Amino acid sequence: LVNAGSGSIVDYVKTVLKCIRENLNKCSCAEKIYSNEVAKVMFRVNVEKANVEEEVKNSLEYFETILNEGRIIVTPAWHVSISSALNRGLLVELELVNKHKGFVIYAGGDDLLAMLPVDEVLDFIKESRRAFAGFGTEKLGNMCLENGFVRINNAYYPSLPIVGRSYSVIIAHYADPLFFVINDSYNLLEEGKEIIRYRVMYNGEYKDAKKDVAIFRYQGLTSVIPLSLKRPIVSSVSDFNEIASIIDVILELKKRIDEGRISVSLLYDYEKYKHLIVASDEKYLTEFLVKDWIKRNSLRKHVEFTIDEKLYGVRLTIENYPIKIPNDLISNIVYTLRIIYGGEK
């Protein structure tokens, strides 16, 4: 509420939300905010019958219901804006599925169903997740992606930066029955995404989020790669460049493997380094264990591949389900590569 409505008005509402917090004044706040309004209404001699003792009350009545209900009071404009943005995000989502040589099966609004090749699937998720949040690189059609604002020829339109977006990738044989591949995709996520928790960074604390997970599956192998790691997914324009930040960590890693700069044995040796990287809670020590695990089974002597170091300790859990997920992020990065590489042989 305070950040919305900027200008001379903000300091007025800044004081209205002040006189609420612990079951406060109960209309005895005018005093603090009447001064705000009445010393303002004389800035123009047109006040018809503005009963300031009621005006500041109705405003105090408004925010009260907002904070009591714990939810934004929904109006048509709130819907029409979310709805239209949902249709503009649909446009950019179709260019991405075409850019990655995929085939759209349906894409209406928030949902999407496509068939990508196993090659362009990781970087699709990377761009699609960020493009949904408005952040993005080069224009796709006649619209650009400007840090949470799709822009069509100088016309800026809002996107949905806060809304999480989960993904579900089934790597399937072309001969697998399409009935059970689509069923799994709706019973791998829609009841598997409902149970997956990871350790998110919330206001300095470390809470347990559950959404926005990008599950991968290849005939038994399953992987979960969180896309946010920060619970209010975007709270500032600097929050965009680390959405899906684990994906390019897998993308860069996958890149260095096929160029022979790192052996594929990297995925098979991590098991012994894992218990130390798990038990180690001092980040200066883990940034050396993964530096060692990388260079040991590396095939050259000039590969300096880093891990963002905010990925040390995620501990993805799952509540009593027929899905076995490794309970740490770096292990899920290894399984994601085995799944991507399993679907190329």
């Binding site: 005093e31 009447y34 009445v38 004389m42």
Partner: protein
Amino acid sequence: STQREYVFIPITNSITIDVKITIGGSDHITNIDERGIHNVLVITGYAVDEKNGRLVPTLDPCDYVKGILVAGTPQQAQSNDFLTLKLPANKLYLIRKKGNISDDLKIYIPYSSPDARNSMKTKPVSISDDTIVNNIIKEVFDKIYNITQKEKVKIEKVKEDIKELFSYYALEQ
């Protein structure tokens, strides 16, 4: 500066003036020029005392004390039970504001020092006995402003000046 003295509207017997000889000049801020009373300076966390009723310090935030502000000095001889303050005229808290002035305001509101032994009780008091104000309407703008009761017509809007507006609190002591 522009020293200012303050009046208010109780339902007590210590209402009318409690102050003597006027401005001595030709200036005031509580203008009643157009469409009724204006600039009734509001003061919160205080009361009426309803008993030689100057102002009362009350931690209660649900208090709406307000009245007419005039210039001059309050009898020039009572240096005991007032507040003796000053504010820059934009740090104030007014009601139904009017023309802006960036001066400083030497405010003189009557406010006694009880040092109460009995707890201050609170009582809601709105405008009653519409005839009771006929005394004080000649004790507010026909006491010092004294342009009323000659050829004015707003004496019907002067009714609605207090028909609804003034709703302060009392003690029940």
